PDB file of C-alpha atoms in Angstrom:
ATOM      1  CA  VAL A   1      14.974  -4.741  43.368  1.00  0.00           C
ATOM      2  CA  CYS A   2      15.630  -2.085  40.412  1.00  0.00           C
ATOM      3  CA  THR A   3      18.023  -0.073  42.501  1.00  0.00           C
ATOM      4  CA  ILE A   4      19.982  -3.048  43.300  1.00  0.00           C
ATOM      5  CA  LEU A   5      20.175  -4.528  39.639  1.00  0.00           C
ATOM      6  CA  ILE A   6      21.093  -0.829  38.525  1.00  0.00           C
ATOM      7  CA  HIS A   7      23.934  -0.698  41.004  1.00  0.00           C
ATOM      8  CA  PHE A   8      24.915  -4.209  40.292  1.00  0.00           C
ATOM      9  CA  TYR A   9      25.817  -3.820  36.510  1.00  0.00           C
ATOM     10  CA  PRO A  10      27.724  -1.243  34.961  1.00  0.00           C
ATOM     11  CA  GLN A  11      25.693   1.628  32.948  1.00  0.00           C
ATOM     12  CA  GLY A  12      26.000   0.509  29.574  1.00  0.00           C
ATOM     13  CA  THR A  13      25.250  -3.073  29.770  1.00  0.00           C
ATOM     14  CA  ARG A  14      21.749  -4.485  28.336  1.00  0.00           C
ATOM     15  CA  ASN A  15      20.400  -5.668  31.613  1.00  0.00           C
ATOM     16  CA  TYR A  16      20.995  -2.118  33.254  1.00  0.00           C
ATOM     17  CA  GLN A  17      18.438  -0.660  30.416  1.00  0.00           C
ATOM     18  CA  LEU A  18      16.017  -3.734  30.644  1.00  0.00           C
ATOM     19  CA  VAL A  19      15.635  -2.973  34.497  1.00  0.00           C
ATOM     20  CA  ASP A  20      15.185   0.746  33.724  1.00  0.00           C
ATOM     21  CA  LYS A  21      12.659  -0.115  31.194  1.00  0.00           C
ATOM     22  CA  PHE A  22      10.873  -2.597  33.547  1.00  0.00           C
ATOM     23  CA  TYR A  23      10.948  -0.047  36.431  1.00  0.00           C
ATOM     24  CA  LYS A  24       9.143   2.388  34.011  1.00  0.00           C
ATOM     25  CA  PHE A  25       6.626   0.042  32.815  1.00  0.00           C
ATOM     26  CA  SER A  26       5.686  -1.371  36.097  1.00  0.00           C
ATOM     27  CA  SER A  27       5.711   2.046  37.942  1.00  0.00           C
ATOM     28  CA  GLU A  28       3.321   3.463  35.230  1.00  0.00           C
ATOM     29  CA  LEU A  29       1.366   0.393  35.756  1.00  0.00           C
ATOM     30  CA  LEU A  30       1.055   0.796  39.576  1.00  0.00           C
ATOM     31  CA  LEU A  31       0.584   4.688  39.301  1.00  0.00           C
ATOM     32  CA  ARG A  32      -2.534   4.107  37.501  1.00  0.00           C
ATOM     33  CA  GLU A  33      -5.583   1.535  38.647  1.00  0.00           C
ATOM     34  CA  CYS A  34      -5.048   2.567  41.922  1.00  0.00           C
ATOM     35  CA  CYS A  35      -6.221   6.250  40.797  1.00  0.00           C
ATOM     36  CA  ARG A  36      -9.364   4.211  39.602  1.00  0.00           C
ATOM     37  CA  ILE A  37      -9.647   2.489  42.629  1.00  0.00           C
TER      38      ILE A  37
ATOM     39  CA  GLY B   1     -18.906   6.844 -23.742  1.00  0.00           C
ATOM     40  CA  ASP B   2     -21.850   8.839 -22.860  1.00  0.00           C
ATOM     41  CA  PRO B   3     -20.012  11.877 -21.392  1.00  0.00           C
ATOM     42  CA  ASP B   4     -22.973  12.606 -19.386  1.00  0.00           C
ATOM     43  CA  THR B   5     -22.514   9.832 -17.421  1.00  0.00           C
ATOM     44  CA  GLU B   6     -18.536  10.249 -17.556  1.00  0.00           C
ATOM     45  CA  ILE B   7     -18.370  13.396 -15.641  1.00  0.00           C
ATOM     46  CA  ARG B   8     -20.591  12.122 -12.848  1.00  0.00           C
ATOM     47  CA  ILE B   9     -17.724   9.591 -12.199  1.00  0.00           C
ATOM     48  CA  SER B  10     -14.970  12.283 -12.631  1.00  0.00           C
ATOM     49  CA  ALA B  11     -16.899  14.268  -9.944  1.00  0.00           C
ATOM     50  CA  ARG B  12     -16.866  11.274  -7.389  1.00  0.00           C
ATOM     51  CA  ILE B  13     -12.922  11.052  -7.524  1.00  0.00           C
ATOM     52  CA  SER B  14     -12.552  14.445  -6.547  1.00  0.00           C
ATOM     53  CA  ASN B  15     -14.911  14.162  -3.590  1.00  0.00           C
ATOM     54  CA  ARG B  16     -12.584  11.232  -2.307  1.00  0.00           C
ATOM     55  CA  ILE B  17      -9.190  13.055  -3.169  1.00  0.00           C
ATOM     56  CA  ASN B  18     -10.402  16.323  -1.431  1.00  0.00           C
ATOM     57  CA  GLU B  19     -11.791  14.250   1.469  1.00  0.00           C
ATOM     58  CA  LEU B  20      -8.527  12.136   1.790  1.00  0.00           C
ATOM     59  CA  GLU B  21      -6.205  15.283   1.524  1.00  0.00           C
ATOM     60  CA  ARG B  22      -7.969  16.913   4.647  1.00  0.00           C
ATOM     61  CA  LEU B  23      -6.830  14.346   6.940  1.00  0.00           C
ATOM     62  CA  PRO B  24      -4.159  15.145   9.633  1.00  0.00           C
ATOM     63  CA  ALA B  25      -0.626  13.931   8.704  1.00  0.00           C
ATOM     64  CA  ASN B  26      -0.254  12.945  12.624  1.00  0.00           C
ATOM     65  CA  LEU B  27      -2.762  10.031  12.123  1.00  0.00           C
ATOM     66  CA  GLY B  28      -1.769   6.989  13.897  1.00  0.00           C
ATOM     67  CA  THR B  29      -3.283   3.637  15.417  1.00  0.00           C
ATOM     68  CA  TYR B  30      -3.760   2.191  18.522  1.00  0.00           C
ATOM     69  CA  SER B  31      -4.463  -1.575  17.651  1.00  0.00           C
ATOM     70  CA  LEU B  32      -5.869  -4.104  20.662  1.00  0.00           C
ATOM     71  CA  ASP B  33      -2.270  -5.692  20.084  1.00  0.00           C
ATOM     72  CA  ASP B  34       0.036  -3.492  21.558  1.00  0.00           C
ATOM     73  CA  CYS B  35      -0.713  -4.922  25.098  1.00  0.00           C
ATOM     74  CA  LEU B  36       1.477  -7.828  24.222  1.00  0.00           C
ATOM     75  CA  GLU B  37       4.455  -5.596  23.473  1.00  0.00           C
ATOM     76  CA  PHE B  38       4.799  -3.577  26.967  1.00  0.00           C
ATOM     77  CA  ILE B  39       5.534  -0.108  25.480  1.00  0.00           C
ATOM     78  CA  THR B  40       7.355   2.146  27.968  1.00  0.00           C
ATOM     79  CA  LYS B  41       7.234   5.668  28.228  1.00  0.00           C
ATOM     80  CA  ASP B  42       9.409   6.233  24.881  1.00  0.00           C
ATOM     81  CA  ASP B  43       9.645   2.765  23.021  1.00  0.00           C
ATOM     82  CA  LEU B  44       8.033   3.137  19.606  1.00  0.00           C
ATOM     83  CA  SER B  45       5.627   0.252  18.937  1.00  0.00           C
ATOM     84  CA  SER B  46       5.514  -1.382  15.599  1.00  0.00           C
ATOM     85  CA  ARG B  47       2.020  -1.112  14.339  1.00  0.00           C
ATOM     86  CA  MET B  48       1.420   2.758  14.631  1.00  0.00           C
ATOM     87  CA  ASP B  49       1.330   3.260  10.831  1.00  0.00           C
ATOM     88  CA  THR B  50      -1.284   0.698   9.686  1.00  0.00           C
ATOM     89  CA  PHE B  51      -3.660   3.456   8.905  1.00  0.00           C
ATOM     90  CA  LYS B  52      -1.560   6.231   7.396  1.00  0.00           C
ATOM     91  CA  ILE B  53       0.113   3.873   4.956  1.00  0.00           C
ATOM     92  CA  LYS B  54      -3.561   2.943   3.710  1.00  0.00           C
ATOM     93  CA  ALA B  55      -4.573   6.610   3.666  1.00  0.00           C
ATOM     94  CA  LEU B  56      -1.749   7.307   1.029  1.00  0.00           C
ATOM     95  CA  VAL B  57      -2.075   4.201  -1.120  1.00  0.00           C
ATOM     96  CA  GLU B  58      -5.573   5.543  -1.946  1.00  0.00           C
ATOM     97  CA  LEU B  59      -4.582   8.860  -2.337  1.00  0.00           C
ATOM     98  CA  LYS B  60      -1.599   8.267  -4.689  1.00  0.00           C
ATOM     99  CA  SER B  61      -3.580   5.430  -6.449  1.00  0.00           C
ATOM    100  CA  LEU B  62      -6.383   7.611  -7.210  1.00  0.00           C
ATOM    101  CA  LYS B  63      -3.673  10.228  -8.548  1.00  0.00           C
ATOM    102  CA  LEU B  64      -1.927   7.542 -10.667  1.00  0.00           C
ATOM    103  CA  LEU B  65      -5.205   6.630 -12.808  1.00  0.00           C
ATOM    104  CA  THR B  66      -4.417   8.337 -15.885  1.00  0.00           C
ATOM    105  CA  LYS B  67      -0.883   6.594 -15.882  1.00  0.00           C
ATOM    106  CA  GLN B  68      -2.105   3.099 -15.672  1.00  0.00           C
ATOM    107  CA  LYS B  69      -4.802   4.264 -18.455  1.00  0.00           C
ATOM    108  CA  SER B  70      -1.899   5.131 -20.866  1.00  0.00           C
ATOM    109  CA  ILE B  71      -0.106   2.133 -19.980  1.00  0.00           C
ATOM    110  CA  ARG B  72      -3.389   0.070 -20.752  1.00  0.00           C
ATOM    111  CA  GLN B  73      -3.415   1.842 -23.869  1.00  0.00           C
ATOM    112  CA  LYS B  74      -0.074   0.672 -24.839  1.00  0.00           C
ATOM    113  CA  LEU B  75      -0.917  -2.807 -23.963  1.00  0.00           C
ATOM    114  CA  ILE B  76      -4.224  -3.302 -25.571  1.00  0.00           C
ATOM    115  CA  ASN B  77      -2.980  -1.571 -28.783  1.00  0.00           C
ATOM    116  CA  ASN B  78      -0.088  -3.920 -28.769  1.00  0.00           C
ATOM    117  CA  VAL B  79      -1.939  -7.148 -28.138  1.00  0.00           C
ATOM    118  CA  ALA B  80      -4.930  -6.297 -30.200  1.00  0.00           C
ATOM    119  CA  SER B  81      -3.022  -4.707 -32.956  1.00  0.00           C
ATOM    120  CA  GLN B  82      -1.407  -8.044 -33.979  1.00  0.00           C
ATOM    121  CA  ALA B  83      -4.863 -10.222 -33.391  1.00  0.00           C
ATOM    122  CA  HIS B  84      -4.014 -12.799 -36.237  1.00  0.00           C
ATOM    123  CA  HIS B  85      -0.570 -14.107 -35.435  1.00  0.00           C
ATOM    124  CA  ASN B  86      -1.097 -15.272 -31.831  1.00  0.00           C
ATOM    125  CA  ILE B  87      -4.412 -16.349 -31.668  1.00  0.00           C
ATOM    126  CA  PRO B  88      -5.005 -19.725 -33.257  1.00  0.00           C
ATOM    127  CA  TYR B  89      -8.311 -19.875 -34.093  1.00  0.00           C
ATOM    128  CA  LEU B  90      -8.336 -16.801 -36.248  1.00  0.00           C
ATOM    129  CA  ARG B  91      -4.990 -17.439 -38.075  1.00  0.00           C
ATOM    130  CA  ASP B  92      -6.387 -20.627 -38.977  1.00  0.00           C
ATOM    131  CA  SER B  93      -9.771 -19.173 -40.704  1.00  0.00           C
ATOM    132  CA  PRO B  94     -10.068 -19.285 -44.349  1.00  0.00           C
ATOM    133  CA  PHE B  95     -10.691 -15.519 -44.941  1.00  0.00           C
ATOM    134  CA  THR B  96      -7.692 -14.475 -42.533  1.00  0.00           C
ATOM    135  CA  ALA B  97      -5.276 -16.742 -44.534  1.00  0.00           C
ATOM    136  CA  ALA B  98      -6.689 -15.819 -47.666  1.00  0.00           C
ATOM    137  CA  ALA B  99      -6.291 -12.260 -46.932  1.00  0.00           C
ATOM    138  CA  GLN B 100      -2.671 -12.290 -45.566  1.00  0.00           C
ATOM    139  CA  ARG B 101      -1.787 -14.415 -48.240  1.00  0.00           C
ATOM    140  CA  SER B 102      -3.595 -11.964 -51.084  1.00  0.00           C
ATOM    141  CA  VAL B 103      -1.689  -8.846 -49.417  1.00  0.00           C
ATOM    142  CA  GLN B 104       2.020 -10.570 -50.258  1.00  0.00           C
ATOM    143  CA  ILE B 105       1.532 -10.842 -54.059  1.00  0.00           C
ATOM    144  CA  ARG B 106       4.296  -9.497 -55.474  1.00  0.00           C
ATOM    145  CA  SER B 107       3.492  -7.188 -58.784  1.00  0.00           C
ATOM    146  CA  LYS B 108       3.711  -9.004 -62.183  1.00  0.00           C
ATOM    147  CA  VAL B 109       6.624  -8.040 -64.371  1.00  0.00           C
ATOM    148  CA  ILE B 110       5.858  -7.026 -67.597  1.00  0.00           C
ATOM    149  CA  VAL B 111       8.201  -8.712 -70.310  1.00  0.00           C
TER     150      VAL B 111
END
């Protein structure tokens, strides 16, 4: 879904950077706590 | 007064100054309320400096002490220096009114 929303918008819109930040936050959230588990 | 127990106060303030001046400058908080902001890899949370401001208000308030002393002297030595024109129950007494009246007596003209 993040690659789809990156390719959908141009590189300068705010919904490009929000999807980038959301990917960073959620990938960080899912890399940890499966290391604990 | 009593400059025995004046130095024992002015040696506790140098303690606090030379204890606050050994904190690291890269001091920062982490409150329990940053979880509601979803800080990314580089996002710059807005409650990072709630201890370093507080650790400078003390360190600069304990160096501006002999400035507020010099402002309090100029306040008290110009409020208490009148003391008989602003306070109502002092400028209505017999003796104060008689003294202020008697200082204004113009000298007698001989002939």
